[PDB]
């Protein structure tokens, strides 16, 4: 069944889960063309597969080439994601492989349960929750792989760095989703919050600055104050 | 022509033959339907007066053998049985017409309506769908279950139809899963068709019976059965021409024939509209679009 605030904590317990976002599979620019005609230019995009309990992410990176000369571009996207996530799923020893698959967007079901259809018993389930996961790009590091690349390339990190050794699952990923939140309202301003104080750094192999506890508290409330204000302003409340 | 006598009618009941159908009253004197049109298959079907639950019938064809109803009070309904004796059988016949206590099949004579809804149904395939080899006549009602529906509990009683799904290994060949799920054609020609129909005709056969079920018992699997066999080929980009010409009729005598005020359950919203607008298909079927807007727009 779908994910929604009922059976949330489902995420932490210790059945293996992943969650898989395509929304940064396929990107372009827009542009006009010489005669003035509107045409789209492809750039490298990214399937964001993430386990939520560990933190253990698989960024698939998508190089331009895969569009080639191919119609349709973005409903392939759904399929090339969908083979991704089997081809990642098949090359995990067996007792590594999730026992549910969560896609964030309802429109990849059907292709991820086709190429599924050898693993019956893993779970293709939506959600109902609107997770922030597209705004995975604004992660300087996630974005500079992904930019750079120059062929097909699976890239891991774990998104959570090493919070997992003081804080939760649950606590791990409501940090994460907040962040994210924030990272998509008000990318700017989000950044700015995240990097102001130039003496926490950010170590080679994190994602995040080296926050303490108590700092960690400082900028959780400061990235909920940018949320409200820019929903007041979206609605005029 | 042939004859399908009556031992009695001890119930009030609604009895239908093909898309006719006629008013008993409890111990009404009525012997059978006579002039029965030798060269297609049959329908007999009741409806108790006091039961409007559970309508039941008969699938056969008067040249595999004489057939007759006799109801029976212990399972209270009108049972289908065989005589094997053929004097006593003509001999039976011909004394309920002299005392002409039978009713004579109403076809008119410009009406091809029995022949297009079951041009390609033959009662050797009935006899698979409904397995009981000890008759020669298949028992069908409303709330049989088929092959299909069972898998997701009796399976004497079951309707084997083939069973169709757009997402199994069957339907989709590894490194062509986009390709084989948005164009079924592998699907339907290589493993349906060529596989395990044989032909088409056969499964036309298959289409008009699911059809008929549904039609004249209710029979919620085999309005499902119906619906798959119709989106499989309307979701073919690639389909024999005299497959689509032929649909094409089917589907518009079907639609002509169904009762006005059951299209709300026997058709699937989703199936028609993407077999008529949407589907590879969408151009080949203008008998059947013309008819379908002209009686039933609101459910498209």
């Not at chain 1, 259809?117 to 597209?134: G, H, M, V």
Request: glycine share 4%; proline share 4%.
């Amino acid at each position: 069944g779908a994910m929604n605030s009922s059976n949330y904590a489902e995420l932490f317990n210790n059945d293996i889960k992943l969650f898989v976002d395509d929304t940064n599979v396929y990107r372009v620019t827009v542009h006009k063309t010489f005669e003035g005609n509107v045409a789209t230019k492809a750039i490298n995009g990214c399937i964001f597969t993430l386990n939520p309990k560990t933190g253990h992410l698989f960024l698939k990176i998508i190089h331009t080439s895969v569009w080639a000369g191919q119609k349709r571009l973005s409903q392939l996207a759904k399929w090339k994601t969908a083979e991704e996530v089997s081809a990642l799923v098949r090359s995990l020893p067996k007792e590594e492989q999730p026992k549910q698959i969560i896609v964030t967007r309802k429109a990849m079901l059907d292709p991820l349960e086709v190429h599924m259809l050898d693993f019956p018993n893993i779970a293709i389930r939506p959600t109902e929750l609107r997770l922030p996961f597209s705004a995975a790009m604004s992660i300087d590091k996630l974005s500079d792989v992904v930019m750079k690349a120059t062929e097909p390339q699976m890239v891991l990190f774990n998104i959570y760095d090493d919070w997992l050794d003081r804080i939760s699952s649950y606590t791990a990923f409501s940090r994460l989703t907040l962040l994210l939140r924030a990272l998509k309202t008000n990318e700017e301003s989000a950044k700015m919050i995240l990097l102001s104080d130039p003496t926490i750094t950010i170590k080679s192999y994190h994602l995040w600055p080296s926050f303490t506890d108590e700092q960690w508290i400082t900028i959780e409330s400061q990235m909920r104050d940018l949320i409200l204000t820019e929903y007041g302003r979206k609605y005029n409340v | 022509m042939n004859t399908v006598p009556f031992t009695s009618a001890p119930i009030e009941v609604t009895i239908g033959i093909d898309q006719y159908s006629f008013n008993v009253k409890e111990n009404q004197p009525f012997h059978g339907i006579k002039d029965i049109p030798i060269g297609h298959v049959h329908v007999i079907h009741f409806q108790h007066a006091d039961n409007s639950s559970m309508r039941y019938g008969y699938w056969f064809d008067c040249r595999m053998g004489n057939f007759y109803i006799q109801y029976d009070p212990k399972d209270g309904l009108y049972k289908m049985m065989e005589e094997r004796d053929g004097a006593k059988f003509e001999n039976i016949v011909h004394n309920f017409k002299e005392r002409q206590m039978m009713v004579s099949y109403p076809k008119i004579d410009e009406d091809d309506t029995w022949y297009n809804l079951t041009e390609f149904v033959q009662m050797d395939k009935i006899r698979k769908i409904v397995r009981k080899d000890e008759n020669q006549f298949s028992y069908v009602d409303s709330s049989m279950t088929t092959v299909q529906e069972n898998e997701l509990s009796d399976p004497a009683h079951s309707l084997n139809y083939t069973v169709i799904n757009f997402k199994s290994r069957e339907a989709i060949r590894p490194g062509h899963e986009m390709e084989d799920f948005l164009d079924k054609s592998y699907y339907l020609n290589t493993v349906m068709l060529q596989g395990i129909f044989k032909n088409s005709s056969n499964y036309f056969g298959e289409l008009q019976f699911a059809f008929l079920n549904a039609m004249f018992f209710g029979n919620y699997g085999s309005s499902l059965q119906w619906h798959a066999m119709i989106e499989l080929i309307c979701s073919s980009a690639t389909v024999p021409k005299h497959m689509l010409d032929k649909l094409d009729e089917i589907l518009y005598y079907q639609i002509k024939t169904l009762p006005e005020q059951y299209s709300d359950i026997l058709l699937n919203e989703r199936v028609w509209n993407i077999c008529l607008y949407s589907s590879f298909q969408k151009n080949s079927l203008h008998n059947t679009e013309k008819i379908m807007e002209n009686k039933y727009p609101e459910l498209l």
